[PDB]
Amino acid sequence: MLNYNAPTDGQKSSIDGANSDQMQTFFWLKKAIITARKEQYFMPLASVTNM
Amino acid sequence: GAGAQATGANPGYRTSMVSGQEHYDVYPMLVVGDDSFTSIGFQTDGKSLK
Amino acid sequence: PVLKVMFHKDTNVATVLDASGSLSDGSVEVGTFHHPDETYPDSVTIYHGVRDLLYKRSAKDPSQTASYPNNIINMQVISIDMKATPRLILGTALPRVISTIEGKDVTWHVDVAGGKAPLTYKWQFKANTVGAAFADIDSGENPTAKTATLINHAVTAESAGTYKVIVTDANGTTIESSSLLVVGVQEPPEVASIVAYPSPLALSVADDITDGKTVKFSSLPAGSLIGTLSIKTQPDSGKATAEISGNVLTVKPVAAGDTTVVVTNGTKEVTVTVNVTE
Amino acid sequence: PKHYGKTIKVYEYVPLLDDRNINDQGIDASGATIVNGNLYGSSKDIGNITSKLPLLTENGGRVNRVGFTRIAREGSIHKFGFFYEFTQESIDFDSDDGLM
């Protein structure tokens, strides 16, 4: 008796008309996936000379 | 692609295609000794890069 | 698909079977319905359709119809017997978007359960250009187009587009899924140097003058485009004669003497050694 | 939370130098526009690195540009259940008390 159907994937809920659609159909965590910086090995070896 | 051309007799080594023909790769496998090189620092306040 | 329902009064057994099928047990035909509902596909199963069909018919004689107090509304005693082919479901779906670079192989796999064996798979491709429509992939050139798994080798910028797979049942029922391919392209690395291959040194040494040598050239930065090659005839033409056609170079040694040939594309040059022995 | 559907989505931010970073913001050191915004992908080749290094002239402007992208991922929810039935006579006349 899913008169809710699935608003995503193109199906329409029964309460909603042909024109309108559900305002919000998902939840957003607002926490992003990020990757760490690559580590360096050759840099600590170098010895600096002033110019 | 620095290596020689790889035919169908490849036993499983890595190859890269250069100008439409596959060629073998070359890998550095490096050794760095003491006091071999130094870094020139320009307005760097004693660090390698700013 | 349309399903057909038959009801047996004595044993309280309702049979669900295909439109073409029939039963000679002594049951009566109550109605028909679509198992995948047009408006609510994943909302109602066979039980709800059978209940809705049985609500109309009469308790005394399932041949005729009746109002509310006289229907068949007790579903606890009624048993549903299924004889129709199971519905076709998509166990595994294609990934919506696939990202890759030029020169790499990509694979699509789809799994379909249910239906009436055997199953037939057809793959279609739509170009990214405007005003394009789905066209069948040539199964003759790519044998994997007929089967469930599709494999493309060394994709290029033209391989970008939308790919769809169509699965057809024995009865003609069709299910499908779609995927999108994104191909990233980089600029050519530009020519740094050109090298000679069979052979960098001495080419092929043949005592017979009639024998001709074959030379192939390549540019070391992988993916670099090499222009049309040109040769510079150099001092001893009597020792040997060199002629270039396209990329390959042909050298015929007239005399038994060492010769050096320089081949250029207009920016970089290759020094190849020619050794001739009598 | 309730009243939000059946889906959860997030953003993933692709780094600068990966091959996933696909965009049209790139300008090479010569100043001309180029197809790829990222300088070089996840390529270990020395040739590409040497050819595509960001080099800056003594008096330079509008030489090197880069761009960024983000990717979204999603998940869904489902429902399961099952039941069983009995009669009073079964539990009343059974020899074993405490069957339920």
Curated annotation (Swiss-Prot), chain B:
Q: What does this protein do?
A: Assembles, to form an icosahedral capsid with a T=9 symmetry, about 60 nm in diameter, and consisting of 535 capsid proteins.
What is the name of the gene encoding this protein?
Answer: 56
From the broadest rank down, the organism's phylogenetic lineage runs: Viruses, Duplodnaviria, Heunggongvirae, Uroviricota, Caudoviricetes
Q: Which section of the whole protein is represented?
A: 302 to 351 of 401
Q: Any idea where this protein resides?
A: Virion
Q: What is this protein called?
A: Major capsid protein
Swiss-Prot record, chain D:
Top-level taxonomic group? Viruses
Q: Where in the cell is it found?
A: Virion
Its function, per the record, reads: Assembles, to form an icosahedral capsid with a T=9 symmetry, about 60 nm in diameter, and consisting of 535 capsid proteins.
Q: What is this protein called?
A: Major capsid protein
Report which part of the complete sequence is shown: 52 to 151 of 401
